[PDB]
Amino acid sequence: SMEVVGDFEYSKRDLVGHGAFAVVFRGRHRQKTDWEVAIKSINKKNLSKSQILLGKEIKILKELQHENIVALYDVQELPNSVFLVMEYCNGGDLADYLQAKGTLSEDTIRVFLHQIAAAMRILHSKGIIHRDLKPQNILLSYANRRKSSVSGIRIKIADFGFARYLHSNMMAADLCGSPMYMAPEVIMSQHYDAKADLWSIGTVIYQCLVGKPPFQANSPQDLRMFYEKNRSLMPSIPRETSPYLANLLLGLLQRNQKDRMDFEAFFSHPFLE
Amino acid sequence: SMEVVGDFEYSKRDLVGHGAFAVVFRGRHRQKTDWEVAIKSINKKNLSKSQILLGKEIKILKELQHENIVALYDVQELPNSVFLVMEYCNGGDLADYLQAKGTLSEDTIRVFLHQIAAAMRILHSKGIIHRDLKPQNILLSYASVSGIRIKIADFGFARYLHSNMMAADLCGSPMYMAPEVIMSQHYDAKADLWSIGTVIYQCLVGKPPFQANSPQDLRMFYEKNRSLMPSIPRETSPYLANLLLGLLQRNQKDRMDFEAFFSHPFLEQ
Numbered sequence: 001s002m003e004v005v006g007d008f009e010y011s012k013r014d015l016v017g018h019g020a021f022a023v024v025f026r027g028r029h030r031q032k033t034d035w036e037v038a039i040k041s042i043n044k045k046n047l048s049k050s051q052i053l054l055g056k057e058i059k060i061l062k063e064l065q066h067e068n069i070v071a072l073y074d075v076q077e078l079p080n081s082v083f084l085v086m087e088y089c090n091g092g093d094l095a096d097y098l099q100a101k102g103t104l105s106e107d108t109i110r111v112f113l114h115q116i117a118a119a120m121r122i123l124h125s126k127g128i129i130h131r132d133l134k135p136q137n138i139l140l141s142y143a144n145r146r147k148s149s150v151s152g153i154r155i156k157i158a159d160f161g162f163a164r165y166l167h168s169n170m171m172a173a174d175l176c177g178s179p180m181y182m183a184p185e186v187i188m189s190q191h192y193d194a195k196a197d198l199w200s201i202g203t204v205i206y207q208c209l210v211g212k213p214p215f216q217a218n219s220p221q222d223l224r225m226f227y228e229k230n231r232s233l234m235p236s237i238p239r240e241t242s243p244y245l246a247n248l249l250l251g252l253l254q255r256n257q258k259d260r261m262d263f264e265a266f267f268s269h270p271f272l273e
Numbered sequence: 274s275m276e277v278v279g280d281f282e283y284s285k286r287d288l289v290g291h292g293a294f295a296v297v298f299r300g301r302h303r304q305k306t307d308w309e310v311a312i313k314s315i316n317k318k319n320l321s322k323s324q325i326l327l328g329k330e331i332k333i334l335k336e337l338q339h340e341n342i343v344a345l346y347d348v349q350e351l352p353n354s355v356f357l358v359m360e361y362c363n364g365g366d367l368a369d370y371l372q373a374k375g376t377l378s379e380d381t382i383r384v385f386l387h388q389i390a391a392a393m394r395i396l397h398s399k400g401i402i403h404r405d406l407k408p409q410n411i412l413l414s415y416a417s418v419s420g421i422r423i424k425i426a427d428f429g430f431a432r433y434l435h436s437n438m439m440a441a442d443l444c445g446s447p448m449y450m451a452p453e454v455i456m457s458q459h460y461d462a463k464a465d466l467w468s469i470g471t472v473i474y475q476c477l478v479g480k481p482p483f484q485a486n487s488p489q490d491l492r493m494f495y496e497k498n499r500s501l502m503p504s505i506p507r508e509t510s511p512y513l514a515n516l517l518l519g520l521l522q523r524n525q526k527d528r529m530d531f532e533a534f535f536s537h538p539f540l541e542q
């Protein structure tokens with residue numbers, strides 16, 4: 001028995017991901033049954049009862065068409081739910097890949113990072129920050145399942161439910177009428193978390209190289225305590241790390257935004273050249 | 274004649290406010306026609322096509338029961354729309370009051386500000402920042418200053434300070450999130466204190482402390498000037514001057530705290 005979602009369907013057995021307000025299944029087109037898709041169901045009702053915002057995943061994915069970002073094929077709205085029918089990544093996530101491979105060569109890291117960079121370029125041009133990049137939403141796709149070496153891997157960024165537009169506060173002000181009462185830091189907020197994704201990518205590269213994240217703690221509150229109590233974070237970089245990768249990690253893993261590497265510097269960095 | 278919304282109704286002619294994706298009408302209960310309500314329609318379809326986020330006005334107003342925050346009586350959800358049926362403020366907004374009065378005495382400012390502070394106290398307890406406080410959404414309900422109750426409205430731009438931190442907790446891995454995302458609670462935490470600063474200033478002086486041609490011009494101004502001195506009349510009392518200077522600090526870190534605001538000697542008088 002299959003659940004039908006417009007022109008698509010899925011089995012409840014083929015769960016590939018979940019979060020607090022969403023589940024994602026492998027499915028397929030009902031007629032072209034070789035066309036595999038990912039079907040995400042978002043619980044709008046539960047979300048409406050929570051402090052966590054609904055977000056703009058549909059608009060953001062609709063606006064992006066890029067080979068390193070999951071495509072959106074269709075949307076079905078219900079009163080309490082919304083379904084997004086998206087590109088299926090047949091290789092799973094980067095966490096699964098690390099589980100199998102342990103740590104990756106620098107050359108593999110470079111190949112992946114080039115694709116991540118290409119995605120970050122389109123996000124940057126559109127003023128979109130993802131804000132939740134991690135191994136679990138950096139996905140692997142094999143266009144030909146026979147060519148399953150590193151060169152056969154295409155990387156695709158997914159799960160944009162936490163993503164935001166940098167210009168949204170300035171757009172709100174334009175629409176509100178008089179902005180003369182709004183706090184300066186609200187008017188100027190574009191310039192605060194603009195480099196959040198660069199830190200994340202830092203932590204992911206680190207984990208690829210070393211086999212754990214650069215900074216671990218018991219719980220989320222404990223890690224928050226750590227970042228708060230240590231204002232100059234030094235990542236522990238293995239001494240055998242190449243000069244350029246060491247340099248790239250040090251520039252990405254700056255606790256303070258203002259010290260962190262710029263996007264133009266990231267995209268130009270010699271590790272990537 | 275009348276649009277029906279559950280147990281209530283309104284005429285499209287009785288508009289009392291509007292914004293980018295919302296309109297508000299004066300309405301009434303269909304049986305108890307002397308019970309006036311404010312009925313808001315939010316265009317969710319248009320909103321979905323914009324960069325501007327669906328907020329949490331329903332949740333916030335549902336969860337609050339406080340005399341200085343507009344009550345929510347009902348919600349009617351449609352595919353493209355939602356109606357909120359809320360408390361009606363028969364006095365209009367603070368801007369309308371300033372239109373009649375010109376400027377307010379310090380004593381009147383203090384009476385209003387006590388009530389605004391009481392609203393800000395409950396928002397602060399719950400980790401809510403309104404982010405768009407202004408004379409147009411600080412409302413008056415009459416049943417003189419002693420008769421006047423202040424109510425805060427329009428929470429469509431409001432945010433929960435802890436929501437990023439809560440997302441991280443519900444991840445299980447907050448491990449890849451940027452420090453400034455994890456700790457963003459400490460960034461716009463005092464947005465409402467600035468806003469209240471500008472409102473008090475306008476009450477006292479009769480204009481906002483800082484005017485620009487356009488929103489982008491005001492953004493340019495705040496960017497270009499790293500400190501900002503409001504022009505305070507010399508006859509302003511020492512405590513009110515102090516309150517204004519401490520609220521109208523361009524930089525969050527220098528701005529007066531909530532505890533200092535709620536305990537401020539201007540209010541203790």
Ligand SMILES: CN1CCc2cc(Nc3ncc(C4CC4)c(NCCCNC(=O)C4CCC4)n3)ccc2C1
Pocket residue numbers: 016017018019022023024038070086087088089090091092093096136137139158159
């Ligand atoms: C054990 N491994 C877990 C990850 C995974 C993902 C996939 N293929 C996949 N393809 C596409 C997508 C969606 C974005 C378009 C996808 N989504 C699940 C993984 C990414 N996380 C999320 O989407 C969040 C879960 C609530 C949103 N997953 C295939 C196998 C496996 C198995």
Ligand SMILES: CN1CCc2cc(Nc3ncc(C4CC4)c(NCCCNC(=O)C4CCC4)n3)ccc2C1
Pocket residue numbers: 289290291292295296297311312313343359360361362363364365366369409410412426427
């Ligand atoms: C010139 N006029 C100014 C506005 C006004 C409001 C009211 N009484 C009133 N009572 C309650 C409410 C709140 C619960 C919905 C209300 N709302 C309009 C004023 C506040 N702005 C908004 O709510 C935004 C407009 C898009 C949301 N307005 C009465 C007369 C007048 C006179």
Ligand code: NA
Pocket residue numbers: 334335336337338344345
């Ligand atoms: Na309530």
